[PDB]
Design a protein around this ligand. Sequence first.
Ligand SMILES: [Mg+2]
Lengths: 244, 250, 240, 215, 222, 231, 235, 233
Amino acid sequence: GSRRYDSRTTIFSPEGRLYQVEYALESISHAGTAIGIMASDGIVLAAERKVTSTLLEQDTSTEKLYKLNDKIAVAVAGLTADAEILINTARIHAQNYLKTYNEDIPVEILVRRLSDIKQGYTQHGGLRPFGVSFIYAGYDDRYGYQLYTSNPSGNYTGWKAISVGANTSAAQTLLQMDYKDDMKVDDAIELALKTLSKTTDSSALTYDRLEFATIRKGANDGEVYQKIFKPQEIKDILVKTGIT
Amino acid sequence: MTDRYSFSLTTFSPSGKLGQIDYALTAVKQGVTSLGIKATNGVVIATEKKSSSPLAMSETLSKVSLLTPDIGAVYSGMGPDYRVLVDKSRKVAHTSYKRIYGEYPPTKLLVSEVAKIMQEATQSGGVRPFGVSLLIAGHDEFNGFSLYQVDPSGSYFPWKATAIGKGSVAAKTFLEKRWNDELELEDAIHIALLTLKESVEGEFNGDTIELAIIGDENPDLLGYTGIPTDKGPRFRKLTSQEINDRLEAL
Amino acid sequence: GYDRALSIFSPDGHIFQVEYALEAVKRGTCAVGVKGKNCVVLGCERRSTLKLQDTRITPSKVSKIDSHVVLSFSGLNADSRILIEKARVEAQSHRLTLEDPVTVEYLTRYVAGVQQRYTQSGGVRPFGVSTLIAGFDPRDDEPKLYQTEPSGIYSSWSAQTIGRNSKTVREFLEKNYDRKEPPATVEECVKLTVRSLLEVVQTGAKNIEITVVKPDSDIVALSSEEINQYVTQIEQEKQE
Amino acid sequence: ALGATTLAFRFQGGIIVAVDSRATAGNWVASQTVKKVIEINPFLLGTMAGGAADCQFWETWLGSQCRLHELREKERISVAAASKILSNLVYQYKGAGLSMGTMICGYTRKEGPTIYYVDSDGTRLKGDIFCVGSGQTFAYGVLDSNYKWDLSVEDALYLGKRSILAAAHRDAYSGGSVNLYHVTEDGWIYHGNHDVGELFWKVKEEEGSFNNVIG
Amino acid sequence: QFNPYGDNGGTILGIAGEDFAVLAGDTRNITDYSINSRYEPKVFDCGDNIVMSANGFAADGDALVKRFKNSVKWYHFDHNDKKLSINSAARNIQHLLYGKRFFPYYVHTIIAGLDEDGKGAVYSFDPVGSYEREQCRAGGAAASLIMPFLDNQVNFKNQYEPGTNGKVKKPLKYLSVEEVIKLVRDSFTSATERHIQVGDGLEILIVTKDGVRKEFYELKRD
Amino acid sequence: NNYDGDTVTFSPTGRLFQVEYALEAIKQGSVTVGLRSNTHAVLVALKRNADELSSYQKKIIKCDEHMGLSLAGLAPDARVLSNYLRQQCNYSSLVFNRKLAVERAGHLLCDKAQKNTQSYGGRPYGVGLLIIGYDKSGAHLLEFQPSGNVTELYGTAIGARSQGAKTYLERTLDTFIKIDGNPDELIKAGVEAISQSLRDESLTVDNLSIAIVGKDTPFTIYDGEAVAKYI
Amino acid sequence: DRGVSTFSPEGRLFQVEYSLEAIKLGSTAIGIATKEGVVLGVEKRATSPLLESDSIEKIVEIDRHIGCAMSGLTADARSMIEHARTAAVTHNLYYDEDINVESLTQSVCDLALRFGELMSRPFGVALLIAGHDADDGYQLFHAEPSGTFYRYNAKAIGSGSEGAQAELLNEWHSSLTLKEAELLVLKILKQVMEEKLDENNAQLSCITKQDGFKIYDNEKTAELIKELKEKEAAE
Amino acid sequence: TQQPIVTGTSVISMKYDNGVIIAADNLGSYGSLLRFNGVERLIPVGDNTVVGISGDISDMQHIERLLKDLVTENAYDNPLADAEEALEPSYIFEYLATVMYQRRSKMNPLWNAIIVAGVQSNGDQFLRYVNLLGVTYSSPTLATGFGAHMANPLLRKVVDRESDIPKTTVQVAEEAIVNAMRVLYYRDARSSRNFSLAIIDKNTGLTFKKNLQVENMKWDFAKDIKGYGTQKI
Ligand SMILES: [Mg+2]
């Protein structure tokens, strides 16, 4: 019958590893680098677009940074199509929580549920896993500013600063070097860009090859604002830090 | 009996490649060249009509398809896969949008729905990916004119101008030299015909070329009068004669 | 639905998928359980290759199943969340129908049953997780410590360890733990647990987690400074 | 559709359970020898009021569930848990037309003597004294006025017997005979069948009650 | 509107002796004021020395008996030809009846046989499955006529020892099979006189350790 | 070789190997014999034990008052098929008040076994059956094979060394067919037939198993001291 | 790979034969049947000294008149026991009586072959089912994952089964008392066990008509072990 | 839940020494309207059974189809289909009775009253009734509808009990049936003069008589009847 053609996506190796999860992580390692840095008064999300073409429409584009709700955003690393499936699920889950409790969903609860979906594809169903790693940046009234990451295994962990995608080994060393706990948002913006500038596989880091976003309490009195940076705004912040 | 193929036929290889998607892209490479160019006051999409036989009527086979009154589509790759995608794309525009909001979806969201269908063929049980890349041109009130590409993986990207299929590498280079942000629609049509002549080998006329535009509203193509807000479709397929007129002053 | 029998017998009478799930447990960070005269202590390793971590929000290794029972584990982290969720649901379901919280033995038997079901169900792989379940039965002061594993077998332990380098720490406990006289106090039990982890861990900074459980739903997690005091005390006595 | 008088009360020495024996189909007396105490197991008792079949069937079913509980947990089932198994079950059938009014009685270590009134519309009440049936009012009157926690086992057995007699006399749909039970921690003890015909005349003479009746 | 139930009349009677048991029933089947059959048996030998009757709505009665006979057959298959005891059969029938608690069999069921000590046994069921063991039980149309007579002659109710000031009851005792059949015949002839649905014929099934014997007696046909 | 992975695959020569491997399980099974006259039909079965401490595996199963079979091969598969026969016999009685014909019984077993040989996932039955019975057209003996093939016979035998008993019955055909109105003599012929398949072992009191059905005889099984008469 | 319900050329089910190899790796379990009762005994086999041996539950009650001992992948036995207990109690509910030991065993064995492509694989555990009923008296059954069950006068299963079975062949007779049977299980267990036999690493049980199924205490078994050693030294 | 539309009235039958007789008129009423006059309500099954049906005609035509299909199915893989393993009246009856009870238990009955008359393989007479409720009974005489009230009393004067069956000839039994059909024509408002009659004999087999008419009727005395009491003219 059909047994002949089954790849058996949800099995263990002799060494106790999940083949497909490991190979999905290998796929993600070739994706454009995405960095998240958490400060005391906000969070930065920076991401490198995959080898841009000059005729690509830059201003009306979205590849790396997606909005989940007013208080939570994600940076993507891997297959964009796979990420969008998961993102719409996450957007729906957040609204279900708001509908049920009349309160914005706590960041971890959203992350756990999305991570549990990934886990399911590794244990049952016979389907390939989602070739996606997320960086979750968000705020709630319990834990304040939070950074998480999830990967195809369905395992998630919290971070002060973290990178996913390509050159994470080199990127994590640079972040570990210059990061400190009493850091401000404006300083974190500078660190994020400097790290990408050194770990990039491109010749020089430019505005058209980047996506950028912040989550500050910079709005008027005790409320959070999400700022997805425009092309011209990235051009300005790149000059202001002295990279171009 | 029954579909026993409930498992994925597309899986990750040790190197991290999704084989079936890569092979689907290879099928698109073999396909005939199609392109799209965005102007300030419109969008143009074009392709060569590769005829299987001279006895065949190439008018009956339409490579450029209307999805909504303001959105059109063209492809490169496997024709049959494209035909069913157009059917599904037209239906999803109604079921998941028009029947809810009482209006046609904006270009980006319809593209998103088509991308979802193509992504599912990459992960669902007992199916192969679609062997096509789409170029979807459209207009909507709040976003204006837009042009999108959609790949077998389900990934989509917005373009100022681009090409896909056989001679896409050369065609993209040609478009980089000619494209600017001040192009009028007629200028974009002219450039589209120049670009397409390079990839076409045999006859080059209105009968062998298929070309449509997303431009101004067409009250004459609406089919009725009396409602001021309804002004007609922005999608218009250029006729065989209309193409030949522009080939003289080329 | 996906029906494939993934867990099956081999010529020599082994179920490789279950045995490979044990290899995943062997890869996981070390976890230790030691029960005293009036308490149980759960110790856990945290690997130090991960700096720039946020310990406030990062999932803790020890999880409360109910107010009186806790569960730690070694192996795949994502898999553990599924067992913990099911266990928490069953704990509340038991209170609802029996009008009494679960015993530690019952909760262990349930979790072990879930693990077993995944070893002979079509379309699923076994859990790559072994658990240490500890606590006190309702209106009871006798300490309980149980272990489970992917196959579905479970049993009670005076003291036990699981995860990477667990055979080393089990060797330590086998000579240091006396059945006739277990750790009489909380301090003695925690010290023996920390000592056992210090045979394997590396440094006693932010690598060791300790959780103490006492009778009548009295559970508390130790902070860095509190644990560091045990580390400082043990090293000074060692130099002799 | 069953007229009955059933009672059960907690006291110093455990639980007394007492019931009548009559079954009627309208005015027609079908039986005088009905067993309205269901022996769920050696430690648990159940009373039958409302539907005869509903009470028999589901309280026998309950004994099967209690046996499975102690096989898996190696411990006697609580009266609380046993009563809740039954109440949760009839709640599932709510609206379908089940008819029950029962007292689940037991004596354990952690609880002591315990009685739960369980009913077909989902009610589950813990209490000290319960009376159920067409003759419950008559039995309550004797119980309330004479009940004390520090009753002896002999006096408690008589009180339950006398309370059923009171109802059997006045309530047309109650009578036949009286079945007594004493529930202890070590199990229940049957205290015989007592024909109301012979019992009435005996109590009249010895007690001096029922002067309205010529004998 | 369609009414799925009907009344086929008839009456049945089960008495239990010391080492025997009888199950009697009239052979008349009716609808409204018409006679369908003057001889339509409704007491059956079901095997394992168990006799059974389900009186009321005949269609439901035949279905139940048919299902129980089938239940006996499968008890032998599944349990190495073990003999089904009368008490086990009773419990089994409860589950058959209660299985249709919300669309009942409109029948009064009675079974007779010998218990495991060899003593006579009779069990009676309500339409939804409640059951009880009894010495004496009448069921059906004329149960109200027959039953108080049995109370008086079998269980000696309301009969006191002569001269004892009504202080000493008449002593209970087992009756012979001959004395029981006399009471059965007199019970049915009396019911035949005063109940229109009772008559035509009387069929009795007697159960001893030796087996199942039958006896038939004519009744008035008006 | 490459064509025996499952039952859905044909070999290049047109063979179904999984069905043939199921047939092999019957050959390993203990011997059982079937034979009939015009008035009666008899089953004789050699029971097998694990060791001296164990019991002897029961080979004969009753299906109705007028029908039953003996088994050889996987016993659980015989339980499934015998249970199916019990239901079909029973369906015929409840619905049509009719005793199921022994020929229809065979047709039903054939069709049930067949479905397991044409579909993916499932497997063939691993047991052979000898069905006897007495219906409206007299005595009958059937041989069931898990390929689906059912055959009506005067006599036969299946299991290990069944060729010896089958040869004997082929010689004795004219004699035992006319044993009418004599149960004990028909059994004797069956016991002598199964004796031709014995090696080293002989027929003992708790080893032999006999069953009979006929004109005025319900299907009944004889074991233990009840078969001491025929040794 | 290959199908789960596949036959070998020799006419056996691969997966059933492979599960039998798993049972040979399991700890030893012995059962002996007498006219005074049936005795069941098992090797606990703790993997480490820190493991509390009293939590090792390899002898199990099904009903008051039926007991059970296991050997092999013991986790697989949980659902078998659950089914057996339900079957026993359900039969009592339907028929107001105790269920025959053979009928109980048959019900358990019906699960055995309900696997394929139902559960994904056969059970990797063998069971000794001991009990009493009014018809056939004291009985001992051996239930395999093949769906087959044999009745036995005495039977050993597990790693030391072939050696223990040969010993049971010589020692068993029809006039064995209950006390004699108890000692005989301990004697044979001590012979095949790796570690030295005591009350903590071995467990006894029995089933009698009068008192029903009972698992022996460690104190009671310890005295029977001491009684056994003295009798062997006495000649 | 149904209501009958096009209906058939009484079906009458009885046993005699060597076999059974059954009869029914050829009418299909539509309420008070005597709409259809060529309706056959006796349906033979083989050469040894006749099923007589009253009540809803659409449900009768459904049963005709079931019986026809039953004969076809019995012949499948059956060499003795015209001999030992042919369909018996008892087989045909039990099948219908099973169906009728199943349909009433789904609250969707076949609105009919059926009488199965025939002769068994051993020569025994078979006569049994079943209706929309699944109720079954047997008797020396059986009738449906008005026939139960008017025919049975006349047929029971001939065969009052079991012992009267050997004493009753086919000539006498047929005479009683034909007389009963006349009485029903006098007194049943939904009856017709035309009818069918069938005899199943153990020796002479199945005799099916069509297009019979009620005759030898008494109407002459009507001329003498004037007014409703006092009227003389
Ligand atoms: Mg009259």
